[PDB]
Amino acid sequence: YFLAPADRHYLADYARQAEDAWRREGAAGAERFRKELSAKEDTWVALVGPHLESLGSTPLSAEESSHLTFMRKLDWPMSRRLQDELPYVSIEFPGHPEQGRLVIQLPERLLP
Amino acid sequence: YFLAPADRHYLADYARQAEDAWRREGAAGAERFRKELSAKEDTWVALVGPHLESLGSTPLSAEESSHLTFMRKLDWPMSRRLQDELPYVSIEFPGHPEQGRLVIQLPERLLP
Numbered sequence: 001y002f003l004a005p006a007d008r009h010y011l012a013d014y015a016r017q018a019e020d021a022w023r024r025e026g027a028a029g030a031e032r033f034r035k036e037l038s039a040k041e042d043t044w045v046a047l048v049g050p051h052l053e054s055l056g057s058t059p060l061s062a063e064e065s066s067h068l069t070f071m072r073k074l075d076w077p078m079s080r081r082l083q084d085e086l087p088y089v090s091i092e093f094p095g096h097p098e099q100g101r102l103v104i105q106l107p108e109r110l111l112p
Numbered sequence: 113y114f115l116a117p118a119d120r121h122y123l124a125d126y127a128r129q130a131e132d133a134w135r136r137e138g139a140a141g142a143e144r145f146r147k148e149l150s151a152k153e154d155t156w157v158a159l160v161g162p163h164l165e166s167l168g169s170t171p172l173s174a175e176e177s178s179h180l181t182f183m184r185k186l187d188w189p190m191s192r193r194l195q196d197e198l199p200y201v202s203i204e205f206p207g208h209p210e211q212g213r214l215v216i217q218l219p220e221r222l223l224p
């Protein structure tokens with residue numbers, strides 16, 4: 001029911017990359033990173049700030065905002081049970097967590 | 113580990129009242145309701161809209177926004193375990209859930 005340690009590390013590295021993109025290029029960097037990661041992992045991705053708004057140039061729809069309310073951290077139990085969908089994983093920016101976080105819907109291959 | 117049915121009903125009724133206040137008086141009504149419920153139940157309360165912003169006249173601080181990300185629904189298992197604090201409970205407005213929700217930090221007396 002828990003992500004393997006190496007998978008936690010892998011996803012955490014994406015949050016580091018997300019933060020770096022935000023820091024280096026701001027909204028435009030967050031937007032490009034979001035698109036690239038989403039395509040790579042074939043899954044929903046968002047970079048969100050302290051007020052849970054998109055850090056990218058494209059705002060979140062209300063539907064997307066609804067994904068932000070029942071999230072899991074990398075070391076928490078994971079399952080499709082409660083909501084019949086893959087969990088949304090919340091991963092703080094590692095350098096300055098107060099600036100934002102990476103949210104990624106768990107890729108299907110990684111589910112415990 | 114689950115709220116008793118009568119307690120689910122009780123808290124759900126607060127969400128109905130919250131929606132009614134929002135519908136009747138807008139931001140001013142949401143603000144007054146939030147204050148009244150918080151005082152009554154001696155606990156943190158927020159009314160938030162589709163973008164997870166306050167429906168009241170006072171905006172959420174970043175600290176308050178952080179309460180919105182790991183919430184529980186009324187019929188989900190409840191515990192202090194995972195985060196060492198009372199759970200934040202998310203309860204949709206019953207008439208028009210797309211317009212907002214009541215968030216209430218679970219009163220201590222109601223914890224399974």
Ligand SMILES: [Cl-]
Nearest residue numbers: 049050051053
């Ligand atoms: Cl934000």
Ligand SMILES: [Cl-]
Nearest residue numbers: 053054059060
């Ligand atoms: Cl947004």
Ligand SMILES: [Cl-]
Nearest residue numbers: 073090091092
């Ligand atoms: Cl985190």
Ligand SMILES: [Cl-]
Nearest residue numbers: 161162163165
């Ligand atoms: Cl809102």
Ligand SMILES: [Cl-]
Nearest residue numbers: 165166171172
């Ligand atoms: Cl707000």
Ligand SMILES: [Cl-]
Nearest residue numbers: 185202203204
């Ligand atoms: Cl609900």
